[PDB]
Paper text:
We discovered a conformational switch in the activation loop of CK1 that regulates its activity on two regulatory regions in PER2 that control its stability and circadian timing in mammals. We show that anion binding regulates the conformation of this switch to reshape the substrate binding cleft and thereby control substrate selectivity.
Both WT and tau coordinate an anion at Site three similarly. However, the mutation disrupted anion binding at Site 1, although it led to only minor structural changes in this anion-binding pocket. Unexpectedly, we observed a loss of anion binding at Site two in tau, mediated by an alternate conformation of the activation loop near this pocket that sterically blocks binding of the anion. A rotation of the backbone at G175 to a left-handed configuration dramatically alters the configuration of upstream residues to create a distinct conformation of the activation loop. Two copies of the kinase are found in the asymmetric unit of the tau crystal. The activation loop is not stabilized by crystal contacts in the alternate ‘loop up’ conformation and was explicitly modeled based on good density in both conformations, suggesting that the kinase has an intrinsic ability to take on two discrete conformations in a switch-like manner. Taken together, these data suggest that the tau mutation allosterically regulates anion binding at Site 2 via the activation loop.
Author numbering: 2 to 291
């Protein structure tokens, strides 16, 4: 029987992540289902070990999955991960690509907090998108988790908190559709960029689409140019027309942050909390899918 170590039976592919695919796993003894990420070792720049280290530095945070680095069985590096529930994109689809305002705001409160927590541990995520947020299981089915640290980067020194310098970006980039304007301009990402991307995710949930999705017959690398140009030419006020002004205020705030600023996470959450409460909502974790 093909197993990881002696413990995790390997199953079918269940998805993709940064730098490697994900397969279903079954603790032969415990019966518990896990996710197993595999990275081919044939590369001069391996990433999965680094990613496992970041997860380990985040462990114990609310909404951070538990992982196990297992080193290299033959041609693959192996990381075993807590199996979570559906992603927010999956749940958006279960909801026929319509979320209520209450659900968007329930999600927004937790997603800002998840990003704040990563930042508190000295990293930026750099690939904020719907598929990297997933709901927990069972008791923790009301908790939003954030996943995938393969593109994450330290933005400040752990001992001195000296911020990384403002420079042209060197590292690989996340999805074009949710990238910040600074990323399109070739500047190193910092805390502000993670939060700006979250603003595009929230407006995606509000709209069902973003105005820069949908593309032209081209080289694909042109396709990135198309997304960049439409995003930069679309004012936040046009993007957010017809939705509560807090979504536009949120995005303007993130765009106006200085590179090394500590974002006012509380302000951003409070914009949405006071909107949520003005509608008579309660933070009772009853999402549309419940």
């Amino acid at each position: 029987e093909l197993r990881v170590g002696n413990r995790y039976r390997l199953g079918r592919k269940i998805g993709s992540g940064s730098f490697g695919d994900i397969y279903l796993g079954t603790d032969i003894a415990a019966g518990e289902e896990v996710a197993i990420k595999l990275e081919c070792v044939k590369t001069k720049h391996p990433q999965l070990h680094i990613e496992s280290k970041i997860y380990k530095m985040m462990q114990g945070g609310v909404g951070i999955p538990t992982i196990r680095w297992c080193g290299a069985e033959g041609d693959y590096n192996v990381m075993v991960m807590e199996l979570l529930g559906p992603s927010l994109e999956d749940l958006f689809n279960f909801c026929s690509r319509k979320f209520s305002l209450k659900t968007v705001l329930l999600l927004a409160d937790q997603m800002i907090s998840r990003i704040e927590y990563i930042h508190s541990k000295n990293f930026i995520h750099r690939d904020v998108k719907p598929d990297n947020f997933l709901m927990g299981l069972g008791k923790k089915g009301n908790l939003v988790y954030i996943i995938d640290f393969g593109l994450a980067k330290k933005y400040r020194d752990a001992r001195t908190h000296q911020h990384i310098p403002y420079r042209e970006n060197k590292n690989l980039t996340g999805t074009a559709c949710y990238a910040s304007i600074n990323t399109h301009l070739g500047i190193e990402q910092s805390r502000r960029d993670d939060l700006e991307s979250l603003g595009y995710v929230l407006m995606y949930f509000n709209l069902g689409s973003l105005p820069w999705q949908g593309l032209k017959a081209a080289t694909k690398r042109q396709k990135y140019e198309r997304i960049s140009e439409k995003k930069m030419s679309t004012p936040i006020e046009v993007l957010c027309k017809g939705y509560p002004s807090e979504f536009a205020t949120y995005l303007n705030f993130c765009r106006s942050l200085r590179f090394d600023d500590k974002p006012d996470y509380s302000y951003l959450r409070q914009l949405f909390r006071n909107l949520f409460h003005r509608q008579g909502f309660s933070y009772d974790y009853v999402f549309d899918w419940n």
